[PDB]
From Swiss-Prot, chain B:
Full-length numbering of the shown residues: 979 to 1044 of 1388
Expression (tissue specificity): Highly expressed in whole brain and in cerebellum, and at lower levels in heart and lung. Detected at low levels in skeletal muscle, spleen, liver, kidney and pancreas.
Location in the cell: Cytoplasm; Cell membrane; Nucleus; Cytoplasm, Cytoskeleton, Microtubule organizing center, Centrosome
Full protein name: Rho-associated protein kinase 2
Stretches assigned to the RhoBD domain: 3-68
Family: Belongs to the protein kinase superfamily. AGC Ser/Thr protein kinase family.
Stretches the record annotates as RHOA binding: 3-68
Quaternary structure (record): Homodimer. Interacts with IRS1. Interacts with RAF1. Interacts with RHOA (activated by GTP). Interacts with RHOB and RHOC. Interacts with PPP1R12A. Interacts with EP300. Interacts with CHORDC1. Interacts with BRCA2. Interacts with NPM1; this interaction enhances ROCK2 activity. Interacts with SORL1. Interacts with PJVK.
The organism of origin for this protein: Bos taurus (Bovine)
Length: 69, 68
C-alpha cells in the first residue's frame, strides 16, 4: 500500500541523490582541471615560441658561419 | 494525503533519474575531452622536443666548427 510505496520511493530518491552528488562532484573537479588546462596550454605555447626562436638563432648562426669565406 | 504523496514521490524519482543520466552523459563528454587534451599534451611535447633537438644539434655543430 501507500506505506511501503513511500518507504521504497524515499529510499530510491536517497540512492539517486547520492549518486547524483558523486557525479556532480566529479564534474566539478573536472571543470577545475579544464581551467587549469587552459593555463598549461598557454605555458606550452609560450615555451614553444621560445624554443622555436632559440632554434632559429642557433640554426641561422651555424648557417652564417658555414657560409663564411 | 498518502496516495498523492506516492504519485509525487514517483515523479520526483523519475526526475532524479533524469538528472543522474544527464550528469553521467556530461561525464562521458568530459571524459573524452581529457583524452583529446592529453593527446594535445603529447603533440605539444613532441613539437617541443623537436624544436629543442634542432636547437641543440645546431649549437653542438657550431661549437665543433668554432673549436677547430
Amino acid at each position: 500500500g501507500s506505506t511501503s510505496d513511500v518507504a521504497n520511493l524515499a529510499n530510491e530518491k536517497e540512492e539517486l541523490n547520492n549518486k547524483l552528488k558523486e557525479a556532480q562532484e566529479q564534474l566539478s573537479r573536472l571543470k577545475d582541471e579544464e581551467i587549469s588546462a587552459a593555463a598549461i596550454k598557454a605555458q606550452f605555447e609560450k615555451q614553444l615560441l621560445t624554443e622555436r626562436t632559440l632554434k632559429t638563432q642557433a640554426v641561422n648562426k651555424l648557417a652564417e658561419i658555414m657560409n663564411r669565406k
